[PDB]
Amino acid sequence: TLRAGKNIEGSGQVHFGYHDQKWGMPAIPMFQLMYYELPGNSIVVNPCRNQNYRLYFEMRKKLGI
Amino acid sequence: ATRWYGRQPGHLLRADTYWIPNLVSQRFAKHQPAHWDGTQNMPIFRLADPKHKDSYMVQFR
Amino acid sequence: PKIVNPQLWPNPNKLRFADLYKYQGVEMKKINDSIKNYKAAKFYIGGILGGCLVFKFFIDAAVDKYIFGENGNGGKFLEMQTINSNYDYYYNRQFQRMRYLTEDPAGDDPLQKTKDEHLVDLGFIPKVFGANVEVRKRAPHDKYL
Amino acid sequence: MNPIQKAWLKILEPVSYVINEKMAKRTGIIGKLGRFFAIGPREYGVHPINRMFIFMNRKYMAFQAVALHRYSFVKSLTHNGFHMLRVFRHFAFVLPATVLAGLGLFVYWGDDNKCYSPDRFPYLKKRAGDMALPLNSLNQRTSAHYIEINAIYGAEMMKRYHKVWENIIEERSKATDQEKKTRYAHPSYQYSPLPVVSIPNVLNPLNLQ
Amino acid sequence: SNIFLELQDGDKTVYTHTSLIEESKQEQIQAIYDKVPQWTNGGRFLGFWLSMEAVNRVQSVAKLPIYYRAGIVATSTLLGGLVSSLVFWKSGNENQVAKLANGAPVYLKKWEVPELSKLYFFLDDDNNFKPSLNHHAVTQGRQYYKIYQH
Amino acid sequence: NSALIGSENQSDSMNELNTNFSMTYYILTVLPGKFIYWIYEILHTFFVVC
Amino acid sequence: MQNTTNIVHVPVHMGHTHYFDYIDSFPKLKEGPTLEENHITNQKILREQLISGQQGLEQNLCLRNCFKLSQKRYIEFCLDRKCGGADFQRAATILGYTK
Numbered sequence: 001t002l003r004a005g006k007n008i009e010g011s012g013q014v015h016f017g018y019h020d021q022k023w024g025m026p027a028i029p030m031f032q033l034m035y036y037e038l039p040g041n042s043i044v045v046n047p048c049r050n051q052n053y054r055l056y057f058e059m060r061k062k063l064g065i
Numbered sequence: 066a067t068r069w070y071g072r073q074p075g076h077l078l079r080a081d082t083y084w085i086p087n088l089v090s091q092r093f094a095k096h097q098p099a100h101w102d103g104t105q106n107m108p109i110f111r112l113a114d115p116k117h118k119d120s121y122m123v124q125f126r
Numbered sequence: 127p128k129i130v131n132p133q134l135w136p137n138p139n140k141l142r143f144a145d146l147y148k149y150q151g152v153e154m155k156k157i158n159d160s161i162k163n164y165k166a167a168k169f170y171i172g173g174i175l176g177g178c179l180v181f182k183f184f185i186d187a188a189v190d191k192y193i194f195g196e197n198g199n200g201g202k203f204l205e206m207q208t209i210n211s212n213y214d215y216y217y218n219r220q221f222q223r224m225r226y227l228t229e230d231p232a233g234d235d236p237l238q239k240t241k242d243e244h245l246v247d248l249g250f251i252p253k254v255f256g257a258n259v260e261v262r263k264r265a266p267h268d269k270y271l
Numbered sequence: 272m273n274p275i276q277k278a279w280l281k282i283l284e285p286v287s288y289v290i291n292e293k294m295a296k297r298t299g300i301i302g303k304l305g306r307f308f309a310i311g312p313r314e315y316g317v318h319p320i321n322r323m324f325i326f327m328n329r330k331y332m333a334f335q336a337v338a339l340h341r342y343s344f345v346k347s348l349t350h351n352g353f354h355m356l357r358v359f360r361h362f363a364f365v366l367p368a369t370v371l372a373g374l375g376l377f378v379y380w381g382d383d384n385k386c387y388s389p390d391r392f393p394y395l396k397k398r399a400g401d402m403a404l405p406l407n408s409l410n411q412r413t414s415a416h417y418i419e420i421n422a423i424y425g426a427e428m429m430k431r432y433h434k435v436w437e438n439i440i441e442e443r444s445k446a447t448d449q450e451k452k453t454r455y456a457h458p459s460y461q462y463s464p465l466p467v468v469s470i471p472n473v474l475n476p477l478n479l480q
Numbered sequence: 481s482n483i484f485l486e487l488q489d490g491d492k493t494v495y496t497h498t499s500l501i502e503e504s505k506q507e508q509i510q511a512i513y514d515k516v517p518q519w520t521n522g523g524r525f526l527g528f529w530l531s532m533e534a535v536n537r538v539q540s541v542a543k544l545p546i547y548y549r550a551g552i553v554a555t556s557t558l559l560g561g562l563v564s565s566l567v568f569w570k571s572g573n574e575n576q577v578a579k580l581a582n583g584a585p586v587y588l589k590k591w592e593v594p595e596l597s598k599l600y601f602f603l604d605d606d607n608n609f610k611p612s613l614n615h616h617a618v619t620q621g622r623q624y625y626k627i628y629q630h
Numbered sequence: 631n632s633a634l635i636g637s638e639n640q641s642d643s644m645n646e647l648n649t650n651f652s653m654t655y656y657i658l659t660v661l662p663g664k665f666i667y668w669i670y671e672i673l674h675t676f677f678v679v680c
Numbered sequence: 681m682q683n684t685t686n687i688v689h690v691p692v693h694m695g696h697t698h699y700f701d702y703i704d705s706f707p708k709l710k711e712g713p714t715l716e717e718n719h720i721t722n723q724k725i726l727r728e729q730l731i732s733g734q735q736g737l738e739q740n741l742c743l744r745n746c747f748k749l750s751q752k753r754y755i756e757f758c759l760d761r762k763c764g765g766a767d768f769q770r771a772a773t774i775l776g777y778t779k
């Protein structure tokens with residue numbers, strides 16, 4: 001956020017002013033069943049990317065491969 | 066411009082064994098073919114946004 | 127191999143003090159017992175590697191079958207499926223249009239923009255325009271979301 | 272002792288002679304230095320890591336024998352061998368399957384070893400210098416085709432521009448000062464000759480082709 | 481419906497794909513290829529029944545090694561399915577699929593036959609965002625061989 | 631913050647007028663009642679889960 | 681100003697559920713055809729386009745590639761050099777850029 005052009009006074013996420021805070025997940029089963037941390041490995045490239053390989057199969061036949 | 070580009074939601078897999086409701090419900094789900102419509106943004110999964118109806122259980126911090 | 131001894135102190139007699147000279151041998155005896163197992167496993171491990179080399183040629187043909195398919199037009203590699211219902215799909219599409227139409231207030235710093243007091247002193251008097259109150263923001267086609 | 276330590280001794284045979292025979296028995300700081308770096312068998316030379324594997328290998332292997340040594344679920348179905356009523360026979364192959372899956376414990380460790388990581392978001396944060404990125408970074412991308420095709424396109428066309436650039440300079444060299452100052456000039460320009468001066472016509476200042 | 485067809489244009493042997501045929505007829509073709517195993521499996525039963533009825537009731541084959549008796553039933557089983565497949569195709573089906581392919585494009589070589597579900601296309605903004613094969617990377621065209629007639 | 635020692639969360643009701651409409655003698659009447667119900671919730675839980 | 685502040689231009693309905701905050705529905709959301717229906721619908725367009733829309737295509741592609749140029753003077757040069765001496769307004773009508 002600093003590199004993106006936003007200078008930061010203070011530190012942390014315990015916002016003293018008029019902002020919403022997000023405390024850490026309470027380490028008790030009640031909250032551990034409703035919530036779970038974001039797994040970065042689940043953010044993926046859309047598989048539509050693989051449909052671009054259709055161009056390759058057509059060019060290969062056009063060139064007689 | 067940077068904030069705007071960042072709200073364009075990313076793609077998040079529906080597969081989830083961490084939430085016990087999905088751990089059970091997805092065992093009975095039927096995977097149907099998603100026929101390509103000519104785009105690169107088909108939301109065939111859930112979206113990586115806290116306000117999505119299938120991602121609200123995830124903690125974005 | 128012979129070890130050089132500075133001879134600063136006399137070593138104990140092996141006959142009178144034998145336990146002091148034993149640990150070295152039992153350590154190598156352990157390693158030798160391990161080597162007997164490494165050698166005895168030459169055929170078991172080799173048979174596996176031989177199977178990997180044979181299995182390698184079937185995987186090559188299955189990859190081409192998986193990617194190119196029957197007639198070189200594409201195989202199951204181009205297939206993609208989903209568990210989302212029809213409502214879930216059109217909900218996500220409208221979720222994309224909403225975030226495309228989700229802006230933040232105040233835009234960027236006007237002080238980082240060209241001043242009207244400066245254009246005057248440069249030779250151009252800007253013309254003041256009115257607000258366009260008749261335009262409605264809408265999302266583009268799905269292909270651009 | 273192990274073979275690797277014996278190899279060091281053969282290599283350090285002359286060093287052992289200098290430090291032990293000559294230095295170690297000298298007085299003063301030269302002796303303290305030799306007796307300190309004396310060469311021989313290692314005091315406290317055991318390797319705890321190697322010993323740790325041996326312990327965990329033996330402890331986990333005894334668990335494999337218990338989990339794998341089970342009565343068959345198949346043989347208990349006929350009610351003719353050793354098992355008439357076994358209401359939990361369907362649990363017989365749970366631990367064996369669990370132990371066999373342990374062979375992939377290290378092969379599949381972490382996220383990158385369970386998928387093609389370049390298609391996952393964490394891979395990007397690593398290529399950006401372990402820097403946090405917006406979650407939609409995998410989508411806001413320029414076509415890889417354009418980047419590589421345009422790099423070839425631009426270079427292939429520069430080769431054709433170099434040839435055209437030569438014919439233009441050649442044809443302009445045979446042009447009069449009047450033409451090279453009136454052609455492509457503004458209509459409102461009135462040509463006025465300049466004093467003739469000697470200015471070489473060098474294509475490439477550096478002696479290049 | 482992903483099926484490659486082999487049609488006879490007189491002396492030529494041409495090839496096509498069901499994806500190149502209207503969906504109204506793809507169902508009629510798929511329904512034909514769905515009745516083949518029931519005619520194949522059905523014929524294997526007769527060849528297995530008639531063979532078992534002969535190697536047992538006829539006291540000339542029953543007085544033979546079991547290996548010879550088992551080979552007849554095994555040979556008659558799959559053989560009864562192949563015969564059923566021929567009667568299924570040759571009767572009125574092999575000629576019907578050819579009729580259902582009337583109007584479809586054909587090709588001289590199987591390698592030239594495209595799968596419509598595998599072709600690349602884009603949504604043309606200049607044509608109401610309709611799907612188009614004539615994408616901005618196209619050069620020449622498709623240029624199939626001919627339209628099938630029967 | 632009324633239970634914190636040297637609180638620095640001055641924006642969390644520390645510099646605001648915070649009254650209520652509950653019974654007075656809070657630590658003698660209200661606060662014990664919250665602990666009484668607490669003991670009921672946990673005793674009813676132990677007896678049930680056990 | 682609040683960091684988690686967003687201005688939305690289309691209606692949204694938020695869920696009134698405990699411990700969760702999300703958009704559960706969009707007012708007046710119509711479910712279009714399924715992916716399998718649009719697929720079949722598109723196959724019919726690609727099929728007719730494959731059989732009846734391939735003749736005279738090489739000429740139209742040259743016109744389309746010429747009209748993707750930056751300046752008009754280069755388009756005219758592209759048409760005269762690559763499209764066999766085609767007219768600017770005559771090609772714009774073929775492509776559908778004329779009113």
Ligand SMILES: CCCCCCCCCCCCCCCCCC(=O)OC[C@H](COP(=O)([O-])OCC(O)COP(=O)([O-])OC[C@@H](COC(=O)CCCCCCCCCCCCCCCCC)OC(=O)CCCCCCCCCCCCCCCCC)OC(=O)CCCCCCCCCCCCCCCCC
Binds near residue numbers: 342344345346361364
């Ligand atoms: C070119 C090749 C040449 C080929 C010829 C060469 C021939 C060489 C032969 C070599 C010998 C091969 C070894 C096998 C034969 C040996 C002969 C013999 O007598 O065996 C006795 C032998 C003696 O027992 P043992 O020595 O004491 O111990 C044996 C085991 O260690 C432990 O024994 P166990 O009995 O304890 O293990 C039991 C285990 C054995 O492991 C398995 O087999 C796994 C089974 C999992 C699948 C079970 C399917 C259940 C029914 C499904 C029905 C639908 C099917 C549809 C399938 C569609 C597929 C998409 O199965 C179970 O776990 C039982 C419980 C399973 C859960 C039951 C749940 C039922 C309810 C489910 C309801 C949900 C659906 C409801 C929907 C309702 C809607 C109507 O027992 C065996 O059978 C050994 C088999 C062990 C596996 C060996 C495999 C070796 C590797 C070979 C390659 C792999 C091939 C196998 C593929 C199988 C398909 C995946």
Ligand SMILES: CCCCCCCCCCCCCCCCCC(=O)OC[C@H](COP(=O)([O-])OCC(O)COP(=O)([O-])OC[C@@H](COC(=O)CCCCCCCCCCCCCCCCC)OC(=O)CCCCCCCCCCCCCCCCC)OC(=O)CCCCCCCCCCCCCCCCC
Binds near residue numbers: 521532535
């Ligand atoms: C890579 C290659 C892969 C190849 C794979 C494909 C090829 C595999 C081949 C498999 C067959 C190999 C074995 C065949 C050679 C057998 C040669 C032989 O010597 O046998 C006679 C031999 C006679 O012994 P013997 O004492 O020395 O004979 C002295 C005198 O002849 C004794 O004097 P006798 O007067 O007392 O005569 C006794 C004789 C009497 O023999 C007879 O009279 C023949 C009667 C047979 C009637 C079968 C038709 C029944 C239905 C009739 C219905 C009519 C009424 C209702 C009509 C309503 C219509 C809707 O005994 C019998 O043989 C009767 C056995 C009855 C078997 C019934 C099995 C029913 C299965 C039904 C499903 C069939 C599916 C076919 C699959 C096709 C599609 C894949 O007995 C045997 O060796 C038994 C062999 C084991 C039986 C094999 C049959 C299958 C058993 C397992 C069940 C599998 C069924 C399939 C289920 C699949 C569905 C999921």
Ligand SMILES: CCCCCCCCCCCCCCCCCC(=O)OC[C@H](COP(=O)([O-])OCC(O)COP(=O)([O-])OC[C@@H](COC(=O)CCCCCCCCCCCCCCCCC)OC(=O)CCCCCCCCCCCCCCCCC)OC(=O)CCCCCCCCCCCCCCCCC
Binds near residue numbers: 652653654655659
């Ligand atoms: C010649 C004659 C000369 C003399 C004639 C005149 C004599 C004097 C006549 C009296 C005139 C009226 C007095 C007016 C001045 C009051 C000034 C004052 O400071 O009062 C503040 C005090 C608090 O009021 P406040 O601060 O203004 O707040 C206003 C609202 O309350 C605020 O509203 P809120 O709802 O928010 O408040 C909640 C409410 C909560 O609701 C309640 O009121 C709680 C009630 C639960 C307890 C009720 C049972 C009490 C009696 C049990 C004993 C039964 C024994 C027999 C059982 C027989 C069964 C059939 O109130 C409280 O929380 C109060 C908590 C503070 C009191 C608790 C701690 C007291 C310590 C007790 C230890 C006693 C040990 C002995 C020590 C003796 C020396 C100090 O006022 C009173 O509590 C009035 C007390 C009246 C006495 C009631 C009967 C007591 C009987 C005790 C019998 C045992 C001793 C036997 C002696 C026998 C002698 C013959």
